[PDB]
């Protein structure tokens, strides 16, 4: 209770493992990524599928 | 970021000294002296 101001949407939600709010999840889902090699992906292209 | 050969993982947390990768740093600490890695 912050004087009637509802901050429950920009504040983090601890149900999900990544401690991100509702609006931050919308921002991360809206901006797609190129899926670069910051995570290792040599073993994905070792198998020819 | 890869794998680290020559350093040991500690379950601690410090304002880190040498950056490595995704949230992992390294430092030359006494806990005999060695290279340790941490978050
Ligand atoms: C704040 O807003 C959310 C959704 O907009 C709502 O579920 C929640 O009940 C609101 N908080 C209060 C105290 O009414």
UniProtKB/Swiss-Prot annotation, chain B:
Biotechnological applications: Main component of the anti-COVID vaccine Chadox1/AZD1222/AstraZeneca; in which the human tPA leader sequence is added in N-terminus to enhance protein secretion.
Q: List the disulfide bonds.
A: 16-25
Source species, domain of life: Viruses
Phenotype for residue 27 to A: No effect on O-glycosylation by host GALNT1
Glycosylated residues?
Answer: 11, 30
Question: Where, per UniProt, does this protein localize?
Answer: Virion membrane; Host endoplasmic reticulum-Golgi intermediate compartment membrane; Host cell membrane
Please describe the post-translational modifications of this protein: The cytoplasmic Cys-rich domain is palmitoylated. Palmitoylated spike proteins drive the formation of localized ordered cholesterol and sphingo-lipid-rich lipid nanodomains in the early Golgi, where viral budding occurs.
Q: What else is known?
A: Variant D614G has become the most prevalent circulating sequence in the global pandemic since April 2020. The mutation is associated with higher viral loads produced in cell culture and animal models. It would not change pathogenicity nor neutralization properties vs vaccination. May be prevalent because the mutation increases virus transmission in human population.
Q: What protein family does this chain belong to?
A: Belongs to the betacoronaviruses spike protein family.
In the record's own words, the domains note is: Contains sequence and structural motifs very similar to those of a bacterial superantigen and can directly bind and activate T-cell receptors. Activation of a broad T-cell repertoire may be involved in the hyperinflammatory syndrome in acute COVID disease.
| Protein name per UniProt | Spike glycoprotein
Biological source species: Severe acute respiratory syndrome coronavirus 2
From the UniProt record, report the name of the gene that encodes this protein.
Answer: S
Segment of the intact protein contained: 647 to 696 of 1273
């Amino acid at each position: 209770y912050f004087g009637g101001f509802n901050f429950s949407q920009i504040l983090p939600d601890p149900s999900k493992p990544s401690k991100r709010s509702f609006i931050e999840d919308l921002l991360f889902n809206k901006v797609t990524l190129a899926d670069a090699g910051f995570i290792k992906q040599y073993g994905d292209c070792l198998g020819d599928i | 970021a890869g794998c680290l050969i020559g350093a040991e993982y500690v379950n601690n947390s410090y304002e880190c000294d040498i950056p490595i990768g995704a949230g992992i740093c390294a430092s030359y600490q006494t806990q005999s002296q060695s290279i340790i890695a941490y978050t």
